[PDB]
Amino acid sequence: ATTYNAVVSKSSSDGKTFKTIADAIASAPAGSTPFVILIKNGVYNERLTITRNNLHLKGESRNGAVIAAATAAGTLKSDGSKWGTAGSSTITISAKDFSAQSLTIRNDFDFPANQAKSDSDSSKIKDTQAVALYVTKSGDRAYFKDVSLVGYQATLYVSGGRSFFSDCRISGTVDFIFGDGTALFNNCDLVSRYRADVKSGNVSGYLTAPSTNINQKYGLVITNSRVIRESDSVPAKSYGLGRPWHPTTTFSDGRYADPNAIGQTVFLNTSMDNHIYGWDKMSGKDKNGNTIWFNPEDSRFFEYKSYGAGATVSKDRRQLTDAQAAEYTQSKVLGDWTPTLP
Numbered sequence: 001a002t003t004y005n006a007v008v009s010k011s012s013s014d015g016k017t018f019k020t021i022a023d024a025i026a027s028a029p030a031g032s033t034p035f036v037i038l039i040k041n042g043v044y045n046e047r048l049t050i051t052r053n054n055l056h057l058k059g060e061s062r063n064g065a066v067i068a069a070a071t072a073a074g075t076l077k078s079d080g081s082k083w084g085t086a087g088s089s090t091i092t093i094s095a096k097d098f099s100a101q102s103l104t105i106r107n108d109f110d111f112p113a114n115q116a117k118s119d120s121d122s123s124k125i126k127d128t129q130a131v132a133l134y135v136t137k138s139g140d141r142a143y144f145k146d147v148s149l150v151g152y153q154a155t156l157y158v159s160g161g162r163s164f165f166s167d168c169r170i171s172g173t174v175d176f177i178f179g180d181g182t183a184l185f186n187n188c189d190l191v192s193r194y195r196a197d198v199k200s201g202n203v204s205g206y207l208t209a210p211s212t213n214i215n216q217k218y219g220l221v222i223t224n225s226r227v228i229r230e231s232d233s234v235p236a237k238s239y240g241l242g243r244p245w246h247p248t249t250t251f252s253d254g255r256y257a258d259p260n261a262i263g264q265t266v267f268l269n270t271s272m273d274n275h276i277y278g279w280d281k282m283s284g285k286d287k288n289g290n291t292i293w294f295n296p297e298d299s300r301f302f303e304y305k306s307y308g309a310g311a312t313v314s315k316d317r318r319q320l321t322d323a324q325a326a327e328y329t330q331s332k333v334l335g336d337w338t339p340t341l342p
């Protein structure tokens, strides 16, 4: 028995429906009773911020129900200020017990077109992060099933509590799954995209950039998934599995890269094509303003039973034991939360 509180559609011949997703979400009564919105096929050019608990979106199909907007971190607002990375997100989840099912969420910032612009072009953006989906510090228990997330740099920003991604597609280039959240991915395709602007022999991107606090048990956990190249033009050994993001953070003694953001990315039973070379380092600014490098060997970067041509076992790619792997079950990673759909 499944019923919808609101329906969104492009058609006026459809009937008693909302024309925008934002209107349907806003129509929800104040409170925390479940509110479920059906979104009929179409491309909805909208930016959304979810602040109501227990809100659920269901698209007609992943292929055909699309929420999309184009915003880069370096895109300017009316007051002349930049949106910033967090501010660039197409969808922002700042509530508990959110779910989205059978829909695509895109940031349509045309990264390749931007990079192709002449260096003297004033419209060429340097701050090229363009987030599709952002789960904030206020988000916990966010569930995404049969969802496609589209972007280049910084596609998925997972902060705050626990999120679960199931039967998913996520595409991107540089740090396309990043943040300090507990984010579990099961049976998703992680799609590394072609970079026309990267020279032969240089790195095209990094799947993950975790900023997991050292005291937090789980960061980014990827299980039973596929790490795939977008095309045969994506070179061998062009993508890192992860690099350690130590976010610029305001402390009592200044603003600098967080020393305690010692990120975790763990891959279990995941296929990898040969575009994967292994893990990588990442730079930030220290308390004195100097460049500081954070190394993968000092980070919580692990694999368990990877397979496919990108799945090499060396001293630079630490492996879990069977006993250690058992600590990364859904039950342990998500704790007392069982992700459920309405």
Ligand SMILES: COC(=O)[C@H]1O[C@H](O[C@@H]2[C@H](O)[C@@H](O)[C@H](O[C@@H]3[C@H](O)[C@@H](O)[C@@H](O[C@@H]4[C@H](O)[C@@H](O)[C@@H](O[C@@H]5[C@H](O)[C@@H](O)[C@@H](O[C@@H]6[C@H](O)[C@@H](O)[C@@H](O)O[C@@H]6C(=O)OC)O[C@@H]5C(=O)O)O[C@@H]4C(=O)O)O[C@@H]3C(=O)O)O[C@@H]2C(=O)O)[C@H](O)[C@@H](O)[C@H]1O
Pocket (backbone or CB within 6 Å): 073, 084, 085, 086, 087, 129, 153, 154, 174, 175, 178, 209, 245, 246, 247, 248, 249, 250
């Ligand atoms: C607690 O107090 C309150 O109650 C306040 O609440 C409100 O505030 C909001 C918000 O809720 C709050 O969290 C926040 O704060 C600051 C900051 O203002 C904000 O800009 C944001 O920053 C993120 C990130 O945390 C930063 O580290 C930094 O990250 C950059 C870069 O943007 C990011 O993409 C990445 O880039 C790497 C690499 O470094 C780069 O070279 C390139 O290669 O790309 C890489 C990549 O793509 O990786 C993903 O890392 C960079 C870095 O410097 O490390 O900027 C980010 C951004 O711009 O979004 O979050 C900060 C935080 O620490 O929380 O403040 C806001 C606000 O005030 O607007 C109320 O509004 C307020 O009044 C209070 O009441």
